[PDB]
Design a protein around this ligand. Structure first.
Ligand code: OGA
Ligand code: MG
Ligand code: NI
Ligand code: ZN
Length: 331
């Protein structure tokens, strides 16, 4: 068995190897990458996502989200308070202000210590989930707006034609902006490209150990657990590495820098934070190996998780028993 310790693997494809996206994902899995739940891909040195970022300041962040924490430093939830619209140029200037900027630090480790000590005492503003792309249309390799769609994968593997579309999303971050512990919708893959700015630190639990994280989360968030049988779908709960280690939960960590891709694999729980002003682009995707994970994915039916149009068909075809109840939550 390849990668039996479930370590995060780092790949350096050549420009030739960067042509065929599906084939490269399958290669990484042949080497055991998926067992970690997360992999890093460093693009060949010849590749670029676009020529420059000099002209992005006029993108609108229609609903910036203030991430307000409750709890203790290592075990907390966050709620998202909606703020007034602002441009990316306005948001960048806010990120760089004395109130929001990255503090002085020695290295990524010192920054990580400061994040876990102090996150709860501040409310950073995150421009998340903005439909759009920063890849140039002429970028032919690993262009996250030109991937094969999940609907087409389901049709190729299973023969059924379904409605829905699959487009990328932009994320504008600042110091302390946080992504809570989650797997993807329908336990899909994700791919995330850090276009510019400061790093993003990731934490991940191997897919084979995901249920250990869920059991800890039920213990740590006991009212949320009674409210919903899949409350991590709400994407609000944080648990620190120190708390995971105290409770014996297997995990790994890695920091993504600008110019690098990360892939999350089906049922790979992940969480993390941004170091400073940055912009990432991410999209969900599927492979043949995903189908069985999609059939078994948990679902929020309490109504809180409220998701995309295209998830309807996935539930309807892969999980017809749950359909009915899941759609009562969505309506
Ligand atoms: O970058 C972020 O805030 C969150 N991204 C992801 O969870 C992802 O790419 O799967
Ligand atoms: Mg612009
Ligand atoms: Ni994710
Ligand atoms: Zn729920």
């Amino acid at each position: 068995a390849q990668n039996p310790n479930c370590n995060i693997m780092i790949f350096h494809p050549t420009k030739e190897e960067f042509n065929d996206f599906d084939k490269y994902i399958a290669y990484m899995e042949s080497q055991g990458a998926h067992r970690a739940g997360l992999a890093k891909i460093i693009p060949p040195k010849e590749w670029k996502a676009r020529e420059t970022y000099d002209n992005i300041s006029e993108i609108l962040i229609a609903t910036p989200l203030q991430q307000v924490a409750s709890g203790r430093a290592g075990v907390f939830t966050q709620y998202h308070k909606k703020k007034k619209a602002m441009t990316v140029g306005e948001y960048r200037h806010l990120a760089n202000s004395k109130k929001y900027q990255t503090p002085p630090h020695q290295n990524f480790e010192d920054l990580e210590r400061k994040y876990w000590k102090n996150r709860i005492y501040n409310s950073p503003i995150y421009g998340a989930d903005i439909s759009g792309s920063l890849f140039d249309e002429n970028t032919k390799q690993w262009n996250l707006g030109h991937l094969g769609t999940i609907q087409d994968l389901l049709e190729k593997e299973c023969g059924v034609v379904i409605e829905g579309v699959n487009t990328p999303y932009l994320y504008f971050g600042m110091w302390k902006t946080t992504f809570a512990w989650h797997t993807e919708d329908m336990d899909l893959y994700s791919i995330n490209y850090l276009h510019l700015g400061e790093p993003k630190t990731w934490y991940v639990v191997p897919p084979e150990h995901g249920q250990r994280l869920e059991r800890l989360a039920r213990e740590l968030f006991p009212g949320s657990s009674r409210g919903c049988g899949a409350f991590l779908r709400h994407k609000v709960a944080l648990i620190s590495p120190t708390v995971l280690k105290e409770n014996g939960i297997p995990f790994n960590r890695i920091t993504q820098e600008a110019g690098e891709f990360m892939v999350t694999f089906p049922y790979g729980y992940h969480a993390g934070f941004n170091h400073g002003f940055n912009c990432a682009e991410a999209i969900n995707f599927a492979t043949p190996r995903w189908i069985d994970y999609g059939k078994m994915a948990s679902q929020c039916s309490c109504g809180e998780a409220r998701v995309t149009f295209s998830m309807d068909a996935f539930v309807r075809i892969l999980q017809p028993e749950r359909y009915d109840l899941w759609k009562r939550g969505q309506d």
